[PDB]
């Protein structure tokens, strides 16, 4: 299925702290604090003027890695974004963000995108009252994201819900902290998000 195993090799192969971690990629070691270079035996050697293709590849990998998604799915969406009328570039990002496993992370129900994924695929999530265990369910302006019933306990939740007090969630979102529930209000504008990504190069990638 989705990728598994070593992650800090990505935190740092793309060469940009991208917070695939929980609280660690925040500590004085996303692994990227200690060793800010590519993994493996050659990470400490002098880089070569990258190939025009290489740059578009690394970028695509970066973004695609952030959401921890499979290329099978990652392009499923890019093609959708292409067809759909819009700015294509930013349209794409909206679709990636509209994912359940991503929302649940943006709403801080869980710390990591991967923690947020297991949370959905276990029943510890509910949409508009219904049980929803599909890390791909696309949410639209108006839905009621929320923690389930039998799941209102579990130190994991309230421990992570607490650390949410102080943090202001992005515009397109909202959260009733005390009640455990958010709402997908709108489709996140480009400006609304500052991904370390140049989405232009990701489009220039699939234009073979």
């Amino acid at each position: 299925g989705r990728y598994i195993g070593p992650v800090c090799r990505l935190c740092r192969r793309e060469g940009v702290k991208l917070y695939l971690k929980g609280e660690r990629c925040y500590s004085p070691k996303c692994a990227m604090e200690r060793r800010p270079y590519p993994p493996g035996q050659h990470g400490q050697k002098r880089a070569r003027r990258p190939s025009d293709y290489a740059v578009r590849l690394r970028e695509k990998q970066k973004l695609r890695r952030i959401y921890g998604i499979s290329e099978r799915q990652f392009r499923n969406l890019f093609e959708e974004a292409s067809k759909k009328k819009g700015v294509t570039g930013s349209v794409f990002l909206g679709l990636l963000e509209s994912r359940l496993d991503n929302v649940v992370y943006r709403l801080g129900f869980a710390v990591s995108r991967r923690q947020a994924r297991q949370l959905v695929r276990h029943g510890h999530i509910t949409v508009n009252g219904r049980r929803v265990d599909l890390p791909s369910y696309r949410v639209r302006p108006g839905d009621e994201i929320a923690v389930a019933e039998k799941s209102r306990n579990l130190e994991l939740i309230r421990q992570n819900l607490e650390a949410m007090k102080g943090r202001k969630v992005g515009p397109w979102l909202s959260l009733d902290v005390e009640g455990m529930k958010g709402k997908f209000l709108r489709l996140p504008d480009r400006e609304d998000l500052a991904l370390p990504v140049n989405e232009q190069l990701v489009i220039e990638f699939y234009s073979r």
């Binding site: 025009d52 819009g86 700015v87 294509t88 570039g89 232009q200 489009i203 220039e204 234009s207």
Partner: protein
């Protein structure tokens, strides 16, 4: 203030009694992404020296690039030597579609939306000189009417 992206570095070689004598050539693009570009081709006995004087000439050859929302006014087709470039304007929200050579230029001059195709000779040197002349020939409804009126 300016931006330098070079597309071509190559090693030519003359011939003299006892060995081949080399020399280098660099194609450099110079722009501001605000509507100004320049193409310079410099050659020197070593890579950097040539790259350097490339930019030199690069600014010795500029051009108005009448943008229109990161695109161009009309569609234009231009030929240099046996090489040919087709510039068709795309609607904002598309992207710059071109090869490595025509892209580097169209980018360091603004243009974030444009459709293009190289025809005839895909030779880099000549395709570039053809793309500049292709921009150098663009006209807007403004300069269009400043032509057709009388007096």
């Amino acid at each position: 203030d300016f931006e330098e992206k070079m597309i071509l570095i190559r090693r030519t070689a003359r011939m003299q009694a006892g060995g081949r004598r080399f020399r280098f050539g660099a194609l450099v693009v110079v722009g501001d992404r605000q509507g100004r570009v320049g193409l310079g081709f410099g050659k020197a006995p070593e890579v950097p020296l040539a790259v350097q004087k490339a930019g030199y000439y690069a600014r010795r050859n500029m051009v108005e690039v009448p943008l229109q929302n990161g695109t161009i006014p009309h569609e234009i087709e231009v030929e240099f030597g046996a090489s040919k470039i087709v510039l068709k304007p795309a609607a904002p929200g598309t992207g710059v579609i071109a090869g490595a050579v025509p892209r580097a230029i169209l980018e360091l001059a603004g243009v974030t939306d444009i459709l293009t195709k190289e025809l005839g000779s895909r030779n880099p040197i000549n395709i570039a000189y053809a793309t500049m002349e292709a921009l150098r020939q663009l006209r807007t409804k403004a300069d269009v009417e400043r032509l057709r009126k009388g007096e």
